[PDB]
Amino acid sequence: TDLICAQKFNGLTVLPPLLTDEMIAQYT
Amino acid sequence: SQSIIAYTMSLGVENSVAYSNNSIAIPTNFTISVTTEILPV
């Protein structure tokens, strides 16, 4: 295992990763 | 006539290696490569 948007509501920015799930799966 | 462009990150050149039961590939030539590694001490 939204909580990601809930953290952004209090002023905490969550940066998205550079390699997405499709890009990581392609490397694998 | 140049500007900043946005694009999806390329995952590299796509090369599908052939596969067969009786097929094999052996190198006919080689090379001596010298690289550089920087490790702080």
Side-chain angles (χ1 to χ4, degrees):
Chain A
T1 59
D2 291 344
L3 296 175
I4 295 171
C5 296
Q7 295 300 321
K8 294 177 179 177
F9 294 160
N10 291 283
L12 300 177
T13 299
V14 176
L15 296 175
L18 177 63
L19 297 175
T20 59
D21 290 344
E22 296 301 321
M23 294 175 71
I24 294 170
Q26 185 64 59
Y27 295 141
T28 299
Chain B
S1 64
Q2 294 178 336
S3 63
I4 295 171
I5 60 173
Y7 60 90
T8 300
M9 179 173 175
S10 178
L11 295 172
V13 176
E14 294 178 351
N15 189 340
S16 178
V17 177
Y19 176 78
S20 178
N21 291 337
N22 291 336
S23 296
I24 189 169
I26 303 301
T28 59
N29 191 340
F30 59 89
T31 188
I32 302 300
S33 178
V34 175
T35 59
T36 299
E37 183 178 2
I38 296 98
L39 296 175
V41 175

mmCIF file with all atom_site columns, all heavy atoms in Angstrom, chain B residues 15-20 23:
data_model
loop_
_atom_site.group_PDB
_atom_site.id
_atom_site.type_symbol
_atom_site.label_atom_id
_atom_site.label_alt_id
_atom_site.label_comp_id
_atom_site.label_asym_id
_atom_site.label_entity_id
_atom_site.label_seq_id
_atom_site.pdbx_PDB_ins_code
_atom_site.Cartn_x
_atom_site.Cartn_y
_atom_site.Cartn_z
_atom_site.occupancy
_atom_site.B_iso_or_equiv
_atom_site.pdbx_formal_charge
_atom_site.auth_seq_id
_atom_site.auth_comp_id
_atom_site.auth_asym_id
_atom_site.auth_atom_id
_atom_site.pdbx_PDB_model_num
ATOM 1  N N   . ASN B 1 15 ? 16.366 -2.730  -29.313 1.00 0.00 ? 15 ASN B N   1
ATOM 2  C CA  . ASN B 1 15 ? 17.004 -3.730  -30.162 1.00 0.00 ? 15 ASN B CA  1
ATOM 3  C C   . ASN B 1 15 ? 16.543 -5.104  -29.695 1.00 0.00 ? 15 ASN B C   1
ATOM 4  O O   . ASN B 1 15 ? 16.816 -5.499  -28.556 1.00 0.00 ? 15 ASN B O   1
ATOM 5  C CB  . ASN B 1 15 ? 18.529 -3.610  -30.104 1.00 0.00 ? 15 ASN B CB  1
ATOM 6  C CG  . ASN B 1 15 ? 19.230 -4.487  -31.130 1.00 0.00 ? 15 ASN B CG  1
ATOM 7  O OD1 . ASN B 1 15 ? 18.661 -5.450  -31.643 1.00 0.00 ? 15 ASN B OD1 1
ATOM 8  N ND2 . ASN B 1 15 ? 20.480 -4.152  -31.431 1.00 0.00 ? 15 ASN B ND2 1
ATOM 9  N N   . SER B 1 16 ? 15.852 -5.830  -30.569 1.00 0.00 ? 16 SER B N   1
ATOM 10 C CA  . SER B 1 16 ? 15.376 -7.173  -30.261 1.00 0.00 ? 16 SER B CA  1
ATOM 11 C C   . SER B 1 16 ? 16.408 -8.174  -30.763 1.00 0.00 ? 16 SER B C   1
ATOM 12 O O   . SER B 1 16 ? 16.606 -8.321  -31.974 1.00 0.00 ? 16 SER B O   1
ATOM 13 C CB  . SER B 1 16 ? 14.009 -7.421  -30.893 1.00 0.00 ? 16 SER B CB  1
ATOM 14 O OG  . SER B 1 16 ? 13.557 -8.737  -30.628 1.00 0.00 ? 16 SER B OG  1
ATOM 15 N N   . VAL B 1 17 ? 17.067 -8.864  -29.833 1.00 0.00 ? 17 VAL B N   1
ATOM 16 C CA  . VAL B 1 17 ? 18.096 -9.827  -30.200 1.00 0.00 ? 17 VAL B CA  1
ATOM 17 C C   . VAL B 1 17 ? 17.435 -11.111 -30.679 1.00 0.00 ? 17 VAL B C   1
ATOM 18 O O   . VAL B 1 17 ? 16.504 -11.624 -30.045 1.00 0.00 ? 17 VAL B O   1
ATOM 19 C CB  . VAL B 1 17 ? 19.036 -10.088 -29.014 1.00 0.00 ? 17 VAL B CB  1
ATOM 20 C CG1 . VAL B 1 17 ? 20.060 -11.157 -29.368 1.00 0.00 ? 17 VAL B CG1 1
ATOM 21 C CG2 . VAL B 1 17 ? 19.724 -8.799  -28.590 1.00 0.00 ? 17 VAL B CG2 1
ATOM 22 N N   . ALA B 1 18 ? 17.911 -11.633 -31.809 1.00 0.00 ? 18 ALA B N   1
ATOM 23 C CA  . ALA B 1 18 ? 17.377 -12.879 -32.336 1.00 0.00 ? 18 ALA B CA  1
ATOM 24 C C   . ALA B 1 18 ? 17.653 -14.025 -31.369 1.00 0.00 ? 18 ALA B C   1
ATOM 25 O O   . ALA B 1 18 ? 18.622 -14.007 -30.607 1.00 0.00 ? 18 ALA B O   1
ATOM 26 C CB  . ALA B 1 18 ? 17.985 -13.184 -33.705 1.00 0.00 ? 18 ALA B CB  1
ATOM 27 N N   . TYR B 1 19 ? 16.777 -15.026 -31.399 1.00 0.00 ? 19 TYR B N   1
ATOM 28 C CA  . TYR B 1 19 ? 16.900 -16.183 -30.523 1.00 0.00 ? 19 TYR B CA  1
ATOM 29 C C   . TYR B 1 19 ? 16.564 -17.441 -31.306 1.00 0.00 ? 19 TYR B C   1
ATOM 30 O O   . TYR B 1 19 ? 15.519 -17.509 -31.959 1.00 0.00 ? 19 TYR B O   1
ATOM 31 C CB  . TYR B 1 19 ? 15.981 -16.055 -29.304 1.00 0.00 ? 19 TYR B CB  1
ATOM 32 C CG  . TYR B 1 19 ? 15.989 -17.264 -28.398 1.00 0.00 ? 19 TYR B CG  1
ATOM 33 C CD1 . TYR B 1 19 ? 17.030 -17.480 -27.504 1.00 0.00 ? 19 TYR B CD1 1
ATOM 34 C CD2 . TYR B 1 19 ? 14.956 -18.191 -28.436 1.00 0.00 ? 19 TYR B CD2 1
ATOM 35 C CE1 . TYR B 1 19 ? 17.041 -18.585 -26.674 1.00 0.00 ? 19 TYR B CE1 1
ATOM 36 C CE2 . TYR B 1 19 ? 14.959 -19.298 -27.611 1.00 0.00 ? 19 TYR B CE2 1
ATOM 37 C CZ  . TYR B 1 19 ? 16.004 -19.490 -26.733 1.00 0.00 ? 19 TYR B CZ  1
ATOM 38 O OH  . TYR B 1 19 ? 16.010 -20.592 -25.908 1.00 0.00 ? 19 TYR B OH  1
ATOM 39 N N   . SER B 1 20 ? 17.450 -18.431 -31.236 1.00 0.00 ? 20 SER B N   1
ATOM 40 C CA  . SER B 1 20 ? 17.227 -19.713 -31.884 1.00 0.00 ? 20 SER B CA  1
ATOM 41 C C   . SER B 1 20 ? 18.002 -20.783 -31.131 1.00 0.00 ? 20 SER B C   1
ATOM 42 O O   . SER B 1 20 ? 18.950 -20.483 -30.400 1.00 0.00 ? 20 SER B O   1
ATOM 43 C CB  . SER B 1 20 ? 17.643 -19.685 -33.359 1.00 0.00 ? 20 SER B CB  1
ATOM 44 O OG  . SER B 1 20 ? 17.456 -20.952 -33.966 1.00 0.00 ? 20 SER B OG  1
ATOM 45 N N   . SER B 1 23 ? 21.387 -21.300 -33.166 1.00 0.00 ? 23 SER B N   1
ATOM 46 C CA  . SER B 1 23 ? 22.097 -20.071 -33.492 1.00 0.00 ? 23 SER B CA  1
ATOM 47 C C   . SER B 1 23 ? 22.924 -19.605 -32.301 1.00 0.00 ? 23 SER B C   1
ATOM 48 O O   . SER B 1 23 ? 22.466 -19.653 -31.155 1.00 0.00 ? 23 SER B O   1
ATOM 49 C CB  . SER B 1 23 ? 21.122 -18.971 -33.912 1.00 0.00 ? 23 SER B CB  1
ATOM 50 O OG  . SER B 1 23 ? 20.447 -19.316 -35.108 1.00 0.00 ? 23 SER B OG  1
#
